[PDB]
Swiss-Prot record:
EC numbers on record: 2.4.1.40, 2.4.1.37
Glycosylation sites: 52
Pathway given in the UniProt record: Protein modification; protein glycosylation
GO cellular component term of the entry, any: vesicle
GO molecular function: antigen binding; fucosylgalactoside 3-alpha-galactosyltransferase activity; glycoprotein-fucosylgalactoside alpha-N-acetylgalactosaminyltransferase activity; manganese ion binding; nucleotide binding
Source species of the chain: Homo sapiens
Annotated protein name in UniProt: Histo-blood group ABO system transferase
GO biological process: carbohydrate metabolic process; lipid glycosylation; protein glycosylation
Amino acid sequence: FMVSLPRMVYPQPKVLTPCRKDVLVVTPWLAPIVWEGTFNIDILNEQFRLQNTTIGLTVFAIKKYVAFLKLFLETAEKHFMVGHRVHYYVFTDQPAAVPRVTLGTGRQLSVLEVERRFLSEVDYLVCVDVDMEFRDHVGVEILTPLFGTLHPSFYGSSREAFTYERRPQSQAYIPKDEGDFYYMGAFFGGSVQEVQRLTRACHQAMMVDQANGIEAVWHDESHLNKYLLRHKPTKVLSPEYLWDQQLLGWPAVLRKLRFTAVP
Ligand SMILES: O=c1ccn([C@@H]2O[C@H](COP(=O)(O)OP(=O)(O)O)[C@@H](O)[C@H]2O)c(=O)[nH]1
Ligand SMILES: CO[C@@H]1O[C@H](CO)[C@@H](O[C@@H]2O[C@H](CO)[C@H](O)[C@H](O)[C@H]2O)[C@H](O)[C@H]1O
Ligand SMILES: [Cl-]
Ligand SMILES: [Hg+2]
Ligand SMILES: [Hg+2]
Ligand SMILES: [Hg+2]
Ligand SMILES: [Hg+2]
Ligand SMILES: [Hg+2]
Ligand SMILES: [Mn+2]
């Protein structure tokens, strides 16, 4: 049961005026491709707040990667799901090394030293790399049952150029005539149920490869791509959500650089 939205005043959408004329904003299976200009964040914030949505953000920080936590968490506080309930889950081998970052109200952080817990604590799970920083808004526009993010190095490439696992002996195998996009393993998510299904499928597939004495060319990312090929994501995030300005600059097609690699 979803409550009704309140009266809102905003620009009327124009049926005969395309959102963006420079990029694809919807996939062939009718999943929105999230680019700046395609969404009214006020409407989306209302929809998700009315459901008291809680987003879990998971990050792994092992060995020297614990050094990336301060900037990651501090910038997430400024740009990630602001206004909504957020639960950070930091998986680390050095609990005492996690920085003391000040959090806004309605936001919490749990340290797990290295789950049915996720199902009862959050509505959506967002899984990202820790050696990153938020530079702009990353909000509820990304929430959906299952989403993948376009790899910044292949968004304009042909499927034949995609670095999928090409060996038939691997469970992550994808032939040259298949593939929608090349998703980067550094940023994916969805409902807890869908994320756990994906993680479970990949874990089992990797065990099979290991038993067959083979390791996918790009490990977890290769399996993620195989999964998303066979289970189409309900939303795809544009490269605005996974960029590297030092290596790729700032092209016009990107109106905002939201989540980037740390040099
Ligand atoms: O020694 C390591 C190596 C990797 N990671 C985690 O694994 C992620 C992905 O691997 P990495 O970032 O090192 O390579 P990349 O994703 O940039 O190709 C890192 O962001 C961390 O979240 C970690 O915690 N400790
Ligand atoms: C310009 O060539 C591209 O350079 C990128 C940055 O080194 C490479 O990024 C890697 O891409 C891999 C998959 O092909 C993995 O995603 C890996 O984690 C990335 O660092 C890119 O491969 C290469 O084509
Ligand atoms: Cl992750
Ligand atoms: Hg638009
Ligand atoms: Hg996760
Ligand atoms: Hg994760
Ligand atoms: Hg998989
Ligand atoms: Hg995966
Ligand atoms: Mn990384």
